[PDB]
Design a protein around this ligand. Sequence first.
Ligand SMILES: Nc1nc2c(ncn2[C@@H]2O[C@H](COP(=O)(O)OP(=O)(O)O)[C@@H](O)[C@H]2O)c(=O)[nH]1
Ligand SMILES: [Mg+2]
Length: 561
Amino acid sequence: MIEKLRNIAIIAHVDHGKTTLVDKLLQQSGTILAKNTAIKWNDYRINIVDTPGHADFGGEVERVMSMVDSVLLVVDAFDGPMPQTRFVTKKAFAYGLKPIVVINKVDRPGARPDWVVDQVFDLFVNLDATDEQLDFPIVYASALNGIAGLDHEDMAEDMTPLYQAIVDHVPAPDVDLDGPFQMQISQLDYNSYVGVIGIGRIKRGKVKPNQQVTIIDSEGKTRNAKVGKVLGHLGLERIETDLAEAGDIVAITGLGELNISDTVCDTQNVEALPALSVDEPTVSMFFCVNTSPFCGKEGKFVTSRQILDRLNKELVHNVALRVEETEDADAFRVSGRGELHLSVLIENMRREGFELAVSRPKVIFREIDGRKQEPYENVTLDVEEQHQGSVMQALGERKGDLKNMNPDGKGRVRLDYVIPSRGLIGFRSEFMTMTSGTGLLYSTFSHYDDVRPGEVGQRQNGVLISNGQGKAVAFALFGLQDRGKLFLGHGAEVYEGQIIGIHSRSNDLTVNCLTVLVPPIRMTLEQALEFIDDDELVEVTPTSIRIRKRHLTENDRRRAN
Ligand SMILES: Nc1nc2c(ncn2[C@@H]2O[C@H](COP(=O)(O)OP(=O)(O)O)[C@@H](O)[C@H]2O)c(=O)[nH]1
Ligand SMILES: [Mg+2]
């Protein structure tokens, strides 16, 4: 009784048809997407909660997973599952959800249902439980036709098989209807007429308008309020309801400025629901002021405790990152998920008009049970077979453990590896030019395990360091090619300590370029950032980043050796 409820989330890569699919389920029932679509189908109430784009480090995904009891993975019948929906799927498994895989667009010519089944199944290499991987039902669809079926040759005349699968395989909400009222805010919304809107799935009890209630946050603070309106979902809309009970995904009004993870409880029996997720950062990196003599050249405006507050602004757009204070009052220890995470932060921190010095990314070590541990992660690589012998030995040098390989049959091959983040850092740069830029690479954090004894091979080559400040002349640069490749041509402005090229030998060579050329080496942010040794820093400015030593003079460098 009152358990005909099906709270399910939906995951789909762009243009894989999740808007069309949900739309068909709506029009064929008794009732861009909406955040939640309520569907009445034969006295069943199915809530389809939407998942955000592949780039949402705010932590909305895990909030969504906290409201649903299953997830709906929509996959193109030809393209198969995309690595963009990787993490959203990962978090679904992390919340112990058993997925329902919908392979739609089955009507397109060359659709390979059998193949995309394997791909999805293999994609569940997300340390996914047997329970999750075994018996995930496969509903084939053609959303643009409104047709579904358990087989793709044998298809129903409507979306009935999909409805049935949802009813059959999605568990009812694990809630008690008779307990005292309890509801955690999962998402927020606003209406200039209604005010702040709190959205979530009622964990316990019931709620009516004008009900007296107590709000308790994650730390333990409490405040009393009276709910104004209880908005239930019906279609793509929200209507005022006189009663909402456990299991219902509803919207509440007039509780003031609700914060996410606040728990709305009956005035007595105030019980805060546990704060849910946190993506522990695995890669640390230093953000420093531009100590360089080019302090305010192109960099619009930055002092010490200026960009610091910007490192207190990105702190809620993402909780996978941390920001700590270093002894150097002009440098800060900011950590994150991967290197790509901290990378793009800079990329339009640059377009934001900033200038900063940044070290090389290092993995965050953790000591557990006396044994130090480092982050390992799963890597899938898609290269041409002319590169497979090359990229294999490369990862092997980076302490990569081979787990699986699968030839394309058409000249390519997909490789799978278990590798510590330590050895994977800055490999994307080497990888691309190694595979001539046709190869592809994807990564996903797996687990912390005992550190692999040893270190990753260092840069081997030394660097050409400028001894003074001035304009680089063609007469000197031509003589420098006798000892390696350089980073600029005639006319470029350089200072002392700045690295201008790559030494042919292993040692650092202090050279002057002040007293026609071969094409200079231009490095992108990530390409350069993978070139950096522990005694160096990248200097980033809104038009182009440059490279330098930590200690600018040759006198200071000798002391630190
Ligand atoms: N041929 C074909 N096209 C489809 C099917 N389902 C959806 N589409 C098309 O895919 C395009 C984008 O799908 P959409 O619903 O927006 O998916 P979303 O972008 O992930 O929300 C639309 O133009 C649809 O016409 C299908 O079963 N067959
Ligand atoms: Mg669209």
